[PDB]
């Protein structure tokens, strides 16, 4: 078999941009709602229009962090709590795999649209700030690079 | 990863209609029994006769919802509790995957027949109303659209 | 040919949505100006962007309705009367065929743009309300349907 | 540059049954509503399920019949007058061609369903009974005939 | 190559019309002579000229009917009794197979000619009326159906 | 070319279900009318819709049974006696072959329709109950069997 | 690839019979031992000799049923408890998949042999009767159907 | 056909063993039940397992034997008389052909099984012993013969 | 036959320029004579020499405009009235199609020549100014575009 | 293609000569009868023998000309009025198309024969002279041109 | 689709020998160390040299056995406890799959070498003797069988 | 068509070096940070430059070790605790599989670079020294061997 000695590969023409975001303190049963921030290289107008494919979200916690942590990506919610009822995937620290793979939830959208989305983060017990790092990995159309110099020479 | 990366795709000629339904409060060990309601676009007579393929059911809970939730789709039962003994699949919040995929349970039936089915929902502890959203996804034959204008020009 | 025992067919990839609108009373020589309202199924954002092809407009009158009725589709006019001077087609009750087939007038536009258009309706004599039904048939790109279930199975 | 000495021909597998119905006296501006009666040979159960294709309706009037006659086929109406506002075709004595060709209005239905339809007939002036014959021509799937003798030589 | 569970099939282009006729009381040794009556659908002039192939005749008696019954088809006879001496086949209740198959007796003739023929029915003992049903099955050229609508347009 | 040592075989896709029914006492010249009862395995809804082909009926009598026995299958009759006048085949104990083979009488119908039929049984003399066994053999479309295990291994 | 939206299919020539059995009350730490009962259609001698392939066993429990349930299929045991030490598979309610798939344990045996086997059912706590339904699914060689009528027509 | 001067031939690999059995006196309306006895050559163990195909039974009576004789082969009956109601074929002296050809009744069984069958013989009048010879002809798989000498000369 | 949903297409190499002109008041039975004015883009010398193909002229009137309107294109006339006696086509408001298609009248001429032509417009009753819009559609050789930049870099 | 974008073309070898003729005053209900005059170029003997194909006649009226005009081409008539009863085509100002196309009326004849024909022109009301121009278009064999200079040498 | 319905198959040339061993009482936190004993058929010298492939070890416990059991195969250890720190696989009762598959740990070794290995068995709580059966399955090269009879014929 | 009977294999040209490291006592909630030490054979300069592929890390614990252990490989950290928030994989004793497979984290790096990495090891409860063995398996380019002798022979 090809087993899990191989990572999941991006589709032709796309590449994967990965970045993280540190949590803010969170009180028991609360649900913070941090927002997505594109990495500088992708903030240009030319790029904010690159089409998205799959999106992965996983958590990095301090070994000490006790309790249960859940997270997900969804559009701005009237009620934070509610995000988890409509999100198409949820990273949950109590499961074997603590990750959320959005296979089609944002396929077709473009970077930038990601800016209108939010990352809801819940904790069953009080958790210090910076105690949870939220990793985000976005598969998107590969950005294009300049192939010509400025036409200086007359 | 290598666990997947791709969603399960519909068969040729079919498409997937998805819709949800919010729960009503539910007391410890109880088993409510809400019923299936087709989306308006599928309520026409022409459509209520489209053949069903696979059916998927999953749950969206508030992070806070404690206890164990189980749900399933089966025919009207004399005893709610009993649905879980004959249902060919059960969505269970304590498992890795909280979903129920009915591969052949309703294959061949038609929308509308779905109206005579029910969604049984159990909870091991008291649960507020609206605390559980039941998502239902039905793979059915794709409906037909008009290819001709009214023959006006004589 | 030897005659038309066949209706005019929608081009490949498109389908035809048909709907109607009832008239409001109209006084002799007057020109009412009702507006286009997309059918619910087509009001979604995803759909309001489907491209239009041909558009057909025809009238259904009570047998009793005396006088002459004329109708057409054009952009909002400063002067109702004037619509008929620029409309590329006019349904006129006095002709053999009381219909207006806009072959290219709106080709390329999208549903929704149709919301900024108007249906001008003129009558040479007084006409009760509901005495004229305006049938509208729009050929547009066929809307898309979901082909994948939600990725649940890990 | 084609021709007009050829009638419109039934599609493969179908044939055309024709029959008529005489009118009842009708008062000025009135709208009688006679109903469809299948010919005896088509009243069997085996036949009442043969699928319909196109349907043609034309009028035969006495030369003397003055005024304007209109007719059409539509489902039972709350208001007779209104049939003409929704009918997909109308036979009108004032036009060049006094006939109504329903190209798809009943395509797919079956004989017998035709029994639930009605023929609305309007006259702008008083018209004696029997002064108008309503011809109806239905293209339907060709009925099957017995190919075997009763098995007696056994 | 096995048994014989197949009925005798009509030749290409032909079909088989079947109909019956009830008997009138008949006294011992008497010979009634009922006449052939085409079924309504075949009474038209167009049809009365369809060519005949084979003709079969069989009897349906009440279980009680005692005695011997004989029947046949032949031209009008000066003497009823005599029909049986020239008929090319006779249905006889005392035989294994109570039927008469006229293979060529009327081949070539046409329906209608059948009107000039008679069905002689003999009984060795008194028999109540309606106690014998005479079944007649005629293989004839398949009647033609209309492939064209009235050239109503032009 | 001999005498036939082969039974008549079912058509491709069909199989033959056989079952019997014991008679009730029957008085001289009387005609009892027992009804068809499908075998349990065929009583399901899925099966009651399997299309019928040929049907065979034969009788098993006690050696002692004297007199003449006749039987047949036909639709419910106003008059039992009359069944024999319209039945397309009759099993008669006085013939060489005491059986009735309905080659097309029920071809096309489905099991269950058979429930609306009857078995008329006549005797010329008094006959004890259970003295006649009526064998029925129906050729019908072969039922379908489950090819998949319940998808438990999610 | 990435998904389980298809059930496990029976091998060529085999089909899957499914049936259930309700439990009897069971006291804490006890191990009941119900026995296999073939469905009526499979009780014939012809069938009790059909060869077995794979055998699947799964449990249906009332949502309320607390504690741990284990079940399995093995030959009659001197000591019920011991069945679980030799059974080649065990359905255990505490696992993700509560089922037991005997891939080769009974391959080669025949139905009927299954009659000499037993279903051992253990519970860690007291359980009411009928609170556990034991589903059994046997893949076996497809039974044969009659292809010939009785040889009546000599 | 055009060749009734040929007997029915055994299928490839099989041969036909024929033997007889003389009757015992039989009183009016009685039904004796003699049993099948394989011929010595077929009594070995190796042979009693040869598979059977078709079985024919015919009667040889003294010219004088008056009355009606009936015979058949069926499994041991509680009531002799009853054999004739279930036997799939009956030799009857009053018919044209006094024989019973069991086409499939015992196909598949093996010689020896024939030992558990019986020959029921009925007579409408008193019949002396030895007045009826019952011929039995069994088509079975051809027995094998020894091709090697004992390896004495070693 | 279908295709009544297609506009007449411009020949290879040509395109269609469309523009309008508003009428000036016109007194009963009078005949105004406005002149053709090329659109700015076509006024260049390079363009005024593009060859013309077909020319179409149609009218846009206020619904209210009563009376009869006629129009046409012809060379400057000594007598306006007379234009209509020599024009090869006339747009007439009383006809089914109110348009004038000059198929060859100006084929071969060039834009600019069109400047020496006139549009004669007649009205049977007084008509306000701006009450009639005269649409003019000219099929002409597609103008050529510049393919080189100015030669500066030399 | 679209009969409204293309004119009717002459057949191979032929060309079309067109010319007109002005009317003379005409009194109500009267029928003038002007005659055909070939154009000078066609008056030569060589030409007056060129064979004719189709002939078209259409009218050019002053906008003012009220009433109904009819015209046609036929042989000299004893009674002008009568021309219209035998002419194979009539130009009638009250129709959609005011033209008369003689498809075969003069096919075969030659120019010059046209000199023996007449143009009958009727008016329902008084009409000034010159108020109606009669256009005549004759398709005839193409005259031949001189290919040689005058031999002025040796 | 290649694992839950199919068992893991031995490689070409190898077969799988399976056998078990019963446990000895074990005290809380203790670690017994039983040894491997080849089955008699494999104890010959010829066999003790057959090469090993994969080795599987799984456990069969009484349903009652509470606590946590762990087991594994490793070389004789100075400290039993330590076996678990170097074993390449461990069967642990607390996991979903209680088995240890040594894919290459002993590949290349031979039976007999297995005699120098040990099975370490740990329990978190006291466990009666015989309460745990240790199943061992060894894939090894298929032994050779005798192909010749002793040569007694000189 | 089997399952989990194979081990993940090194890519072409690479091989896998495995070695271990014993832990040092660790206090509750503490996180020790041992460092990577290449095996002697890999310490040469020639080798320290061999490129790495995948890296696997798994734990071997004493059965007694209670509490939760977590481990991972990452670059030297300012804060030990933090390693677990950025490591791309973590071996966690509470999961089903206690291992960490770094698929690409160090792909491309070289042995030696591994020397600048660290193994962070956390424990939720106090753990004796040597109680945890950390297994490390590195897939790297296969080192080369000497193919020549020293050229001593001139």
Swiss-Prot record, chains A, B, C, D, E, F, G, H, I, J, K, L:
Which cellular component terms (GO) are annotated to the entry?
host cell endoplasmic reticulum; ribonucleoprotein complex; T=3 icosahedral viral capsid; viral nucleocapsid
Q: Where in the cell is it found?
A: Virion
The main location class comes to virion
Recorded GO terms, molecular function?
A: RNA binding; structural molecule activity
Keywords noted in UniProt: Capsid protein, Ribonucleoprotein, RNA-binding, T=3 icosahedral capsid protein, Viral nucleoprotein, Virion
What is its biological role?
Capsid protein. Binds specifically to the subgenomic RNA4 to ensure selective packaging.
Query: What note about domains is in the entry?
Result: The N-terminal arginine-rich region binds selectively to subgenomic RNA4.
> So what family is this one in?
Belongs to the bromovirus capsid protein family.
Q: What's the protein here called?
A: Capsid protein
The residues of the intact protein that this chain contains are 36 to 189 of 189
């Amino acid at each position: 078999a090809a087993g899990q000695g191989k990572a999941i590969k991006a589709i032709a023409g796309y590449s994967i941009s990965k970045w993280e975001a540190s949590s803010d303190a969170i009180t028991a049963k609360a649900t913070n709602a941090m927002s997505i921030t594109l990495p500088h290289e992708l903030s240009s107008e030319k790029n904010k229009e690159l089409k998205v494919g799959r999106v992965l979200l996983w958590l990095g916690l301090l070994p000490s962090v006790a309790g249960r942590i859940k997270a997900c990506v969804a559009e701005k919610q009237a009620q934070a709590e509610a995000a988890f009822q409509v999100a198409l995937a949820v990273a949950d620290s109590s499961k074997e795999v603590v990750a959320a793979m959005y296979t089609d939830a944002f396929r077709g959208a473009t970077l930038g649209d990601l800016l209108n989305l939010q990352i809801y983060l819940y904790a069953s017990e009080a958790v210090p700030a910076k105690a949870v790092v939220v990793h985000l990995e976005v598969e998107h159309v590969r950005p294009t690079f300049d192939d010509f110099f400025t036409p200086v020479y007359r």
